[PDB]
């Protein structure tokens, strides 16, 4: 009915095509991000499909530069095209202005790219949500972006399948300005609260930055210390 085209509103004024693209997000792995004292971090689960897969390859935390990073969930091909568009947009802003002063417009350019395909006929939306985390001249920023293009800045969030659970636990447990070790411990406990027990958390990716420093990926052993 009001259902099989991006350019058709419902009688209640809804785009079911966009909300179906939002349903595509819920099939991805759970990732989270949170602000802490002078910094911000990202944590991400991974499907380990087999033992023949490379570990040290396609990773759910992607750097956008040395001062913006991002995690994705949804269709992985769309997500890779999005992260590469975000990287090109960041480098264009660096050519034009010498530096990236607000992450929010990098998020806005990515989200306007995503909104543009919820409107014109002959394209489909992007079935991906993203979380951006980084330092700019305002401070630590943390965003999410969704198939509609809606931008939200948060203290902490998730995306993916266990998102609701990870939100609800943070809806009981998150505090501002934690030290970094405590913030990661809270994040790992949050990610464990989304699993269905019996099932156990294999080694997740964690990135983080503090103000005045550059980027920092935990290697797997530093992650093992918190499991």
């Amino acid at each position: 009915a009001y259902d099989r085209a991006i350019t058709v509103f419902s009688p209640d004024g809804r785009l079911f095509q966009v909300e179906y693209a939002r349903e595509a997000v819920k099939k991805g792995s759970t990732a989270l991000g949170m602000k802490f004292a002078n910094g911000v971090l990202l944590i991400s689960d991974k499907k380990v499909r087999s033992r023949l897969i490379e570990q040290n390859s396609i990773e759910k935390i992607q750097l956008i530069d040395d001062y913006v990073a991002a995690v994705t969930s949804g269709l992985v091909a769309d997500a890779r095209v999005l992260v590469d568009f975000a990287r090109i947009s960041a480098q264009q802003e660096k050519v034009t202005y010498g530096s990236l002063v607000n992450i929010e417009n990098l998020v806005k350019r990515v989200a306007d790219q995503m909104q543009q395909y919820t409107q014109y006929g002959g394209v489909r939306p992007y079935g991906v949500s993203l979380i951006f985390a980084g330092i700019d001249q305002i401070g630590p920023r943390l965003f999410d972006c969704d198939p509609a293009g809606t931008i939200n800045e948060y203290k902490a969030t998730a995306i993916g399948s266990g998102k609701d659970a990870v939100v609800s636990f943070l809806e009981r447990e998150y505090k501002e300005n934690l030290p970094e070790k405590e913030a990661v411990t809270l994040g790992i406990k949050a990610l464990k609260s989304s699993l269905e027990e019996g099932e156990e958390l294999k080694a997740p990716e964690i990135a983080s930055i503090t103000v005045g420093n550059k980027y920092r990926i935990y290697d797997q052993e530093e992650v093992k210390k918190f499991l």
Binding site: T96, G98, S99, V101, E104, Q137, I138
Partner: protein, 203 residues
């Protein structure tokens, strides 16, 4: 024409003459070459008049759109980089202008931009026809341990030397001091005449 911009301890002082010609034939005894480009930074003009006023309109627009989208002011390195990319995207239908943009974000700055878009920092700078004179007096008298009052006195002495020894400059000097505390404040003409009559430069 002549402009002058001085970075000192926590402030930046920018002043111009006001005489626009536009011919040989000095035509406008009171122009406007000192523009506030944002709530903590300003821009001075030393080139072709029409092109430079277009530049001022564009930079006011872009920095206001910036402050609106990001809820914070633009840094001075960013505005000079933006201005350099603007002047260097078109240099074979070029702008014949010498821009000088000063301001304070967390530390005072005054940047000079030529017609080709070479942005470069300096602790004091000057552009225009009567520019080597104020470079002479700022080479001889400027110290970075000055206050704001000694700074604006130095600036008025500079532009007075340039008005005395150059045809293209002249007219009533206008000065604006931009600091982090009180923001961008342009001095009224009464205080400027007061400093002129105090420093013994009136004739």
């Amino acid at each position: 024409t002549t402009t002058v911009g001085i970075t000192l301890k926590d402030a930046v002082i920018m002043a111009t003459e006001r005489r626009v010609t536009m011919e040989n034939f000095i035509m406008h005894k009171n122009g406007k070459k000192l523009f506030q480009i944002d709530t903590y930074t300003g821009m001075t003009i030393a080139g072709l008049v029409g092109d430079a006023q277009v530049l001022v309109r564009y930079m006011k627009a872009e920095l206001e759109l910036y402050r609106l989208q990001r809820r914070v002011n633009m840094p001075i390195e960013a505005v000079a980089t933006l201005l350099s990319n603007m002047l260097n995207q078109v240099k074979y239908m070029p702008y014949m202008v010498q821009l000088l943009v000063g301001g304070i974000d967390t530390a005072p700055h005054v940047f000079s931009i030529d017609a080709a878009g070479g942005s470069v920092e300096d602790i004091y700078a000057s552009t225009g026809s009567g520019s080597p004179f104020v470079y002479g007096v700022l080479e001889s008298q400027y110290s970075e341990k000055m206050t704001v009052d000694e700074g604006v006195d130095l600036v008025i002495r500079a532009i007075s030397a340039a008005k005395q020894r150059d045809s293209a400059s002249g007219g009533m000097i206008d000065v604006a001091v931009i600091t982090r505390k009180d923001g961008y404040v342009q001095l009224p003409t009464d205080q400027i005449e007061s400093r002129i009559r105090k420093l013994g430069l009136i004739l």
